[PDB]
Amino acid sequence: EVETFAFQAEIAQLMSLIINTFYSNKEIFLRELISNSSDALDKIRYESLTDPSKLDSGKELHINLIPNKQDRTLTIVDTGIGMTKADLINNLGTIAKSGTKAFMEALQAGADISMIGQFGVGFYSAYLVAEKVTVITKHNDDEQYAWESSAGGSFTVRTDTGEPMGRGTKVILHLKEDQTEYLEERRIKEIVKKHSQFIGYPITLFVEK
């Protein structure tokens, strides 16, 4: 059972701008997704200071980067607080609406795409390099869900029957055919070292077999 939803008009406009605009500095997608993972891990860490049982679904707080050349996917996994069904349908889009309006006003005033994180909508930079994005997430208070969008104005949500995650978020980037450089180890290492060197969680870059 798969539910299909329309993005709000403003978010569809931002995604289309990100996919169509000529912008060479695409590597900032990884900084934005890692930053999103680090915020999610801060949240579950804080909540567990006053409620240690919130870590029953997983004590480890980390980030894993997994390239897969056979599937042409780059996966960013965190064990953060994860996302509920309401987040995927309502809450994230509500905050992304005003962040998108501020971001697009700044772009006409001279700002550039690399500042997208300053407006809270850094996740959409994944469409600089991905033709489709799948998100598997599990929050302590809800079930495991799969979110997916190839842009074009819509996204889907379904209950995930795959491997149980425990807690956290998995962002699967189905890469465009001409962005496979972000599957190379030496390239991911360079981006992480340059943009995410001080993240206060262990970042493990997996190697391909």
Ligand X SMILES: Cc1cccc(Oc2ccc(N)cn2)c1C
Residue 64 labeled ligand binder: no
Measured from the CB atom, the residue of 29 and 147 that comes closer to ligand X is 147
Residues near ligand X, by CB under 6 A: 7, 11, 88-89, 92-93, 96, 123, 135, 147
Q: How far is the CB of 147 from ligand X (least distance, A)?
A: 5
Residue 25 labeled ligand binder: no
Measured from the CB atom, the residue of 9 and 205 that comes closer to ligand X is 9
**Dist CA 126 CA 110 (whole Å):** 22
Measured from the CB atom, the residue of 93 and 187 that comes closer to ligand X is 93
**Dist CA 185 CA 176 (whole Å):** 18
Residue 160 labeled ligand binder: no
Q: How far is the CB of 102 from ligand X (least distance, A)?
A: 15
Phi-psi region of 152 (alpha: psi -120 to 50; beta: other; left: phi over 0): left
Q: Encode burial over 101-135: b for 16+ CB neighbours within 10 A, e otherwise.
A: eebbeebeeeeebeebbebbbbbbbbbbbbebbbb
Binding-site positions for ATP: 36, 78, 97, 123
Binding-site positions: 36, 78, 97, 123
